[PDB]
Write a protein that binds this ligand. Structure first.
Ligand SMILES: [Ca+2]
Ligand SMILES: [Ca+2]
Ligand SMILES: [Ca+2]
Ligand SMILES: [Ca+2]
Ligand SMILES: [Zn+2]
Length: 316
């Protein structure tokens, strides 16, 4: 839309009030012109036709309950853009400030959110298993990191490469959540998952076995469901990432943590420099060891911790 940049205010899914970048042109639209080629949020109006209508509002105040999911989708896309720009020097997901588009209110009672190859799509949840999925900043950054991966390594979505694909989205989703310092933790989707049960989440990176996911390579799922375990086997990489960052002793292997910031720099470098569409876990380990070597030297503690972590989850 062509018009004047301005700032509106509203409430997100969790009831918190925030300012959002809007555009004025007769109506106020959810169009943020301050980042790259723009961040645009659309109303899919409970249908599955995409993208829907660019979100238009008469007075620039978004406090209706129908507005909530749009406010957070729009706002957390901006935060994820900022993270990648300020921390990794990457401008949008293609690296050239591509516009970021999201539709909310997709379908009815839809207990998911996803990057479809061209834009973000968020269901509102059935209200029991989930509440509107854009209320979770780690969900938003997880799915937007699939667009980064698609433009760089290109990890195919099945078997070990898909498991790496998923782990990379959980890692940067978590790092964005720490960057915005929004009650950060190492769990995924806890702000929007089961509104009636406190303390749980979809997955855990610090202890994947809590929800039944493998935390060691000898426990990996080898059948065919979930495209060969892409959501299940990512627990092995998630546990490795958690140990590189935070340290700990895992199946008797001790790892000295080197922190979140170094974890993000090693994995971002591995992702954009060394991973390919068919990389498998062993090649991820080699990419992460080469990245840490590039940045910190082959005899650094950083390199030694990347090795211990992968040894602890059984990946050689
Ligand atoms: Ca309004
Ligand atoms: Ca959290
Ligand atoms: Ca989280
Ligand atoms: Ca819950
Ligand atoms: Zn994913």
């Amino acid at each position: 839309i062509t018009g004047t940049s301005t700032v509106g205010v509203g409430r997100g899914v969790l009831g918190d009030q925030k300012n959002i970048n809007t555009t004025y042109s007769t109506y106020y639209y959810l169009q943020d012109n301050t980042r790259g080629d723009g961040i645009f949020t659309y109303d899919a109006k409970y249908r599955t036709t995409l993208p829907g209508s660019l979100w238009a509002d008469a007075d620039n105040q978004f406090f209706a309950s129908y507005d909530a999911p749009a406010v957070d989708a729009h706002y957390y896309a901006g935060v994820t853009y900022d993270y990648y720009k300020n921390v990794h020097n990457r401008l949008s997901y293609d690296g050239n400030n591509a516009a970021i588009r999201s539709s909310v209110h997709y379908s009815q009672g839809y207990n998911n959110a996803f990057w479809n190859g061209s834009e973000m799509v968020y269901g509102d949840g059935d209200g029991q298993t989930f509440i509107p999925l854009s209320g979770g900043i780690d969900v938003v950054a997880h799915e937007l990191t699939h667009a980064v991966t698609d433009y760089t390594a290109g990890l195919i979505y099945q078997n070990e490469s898909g498991a790496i694909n998923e782990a990379i989205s959980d890692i940067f989703g978590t790092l964005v959540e720490f960057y915005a310092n929004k009650n950060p933790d190492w769990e995924i989707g806890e702000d929007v998952y089961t509104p009636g049960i406190s303390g749980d989440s979809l997955r855990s990176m610090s202890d994947p076995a809590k929800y039944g996911d493998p935390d060691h390579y000898s426990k990996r799922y080898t059948g065919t469901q979930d495209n060969g375990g892409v959501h299940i086997n990512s627990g092995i990489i998630n546990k490795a990432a958690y140990l590189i960052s935070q340290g700990g002793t895992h199946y008797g292997v001790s790892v000295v943590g080197i922190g979140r910031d170094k974890l993000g720099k090693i994995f971002y470098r591995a992702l954009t420099q060394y991973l390919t569409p068919t990389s498998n876990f062993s090649q991820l380990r080699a990419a992460a060891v080469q990245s840490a070597t590039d940045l910190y030297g082959s005899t650094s503690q950083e390199v030694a911790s990347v090795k211990q972590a992968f040894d602890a989850v059984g990946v050689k």
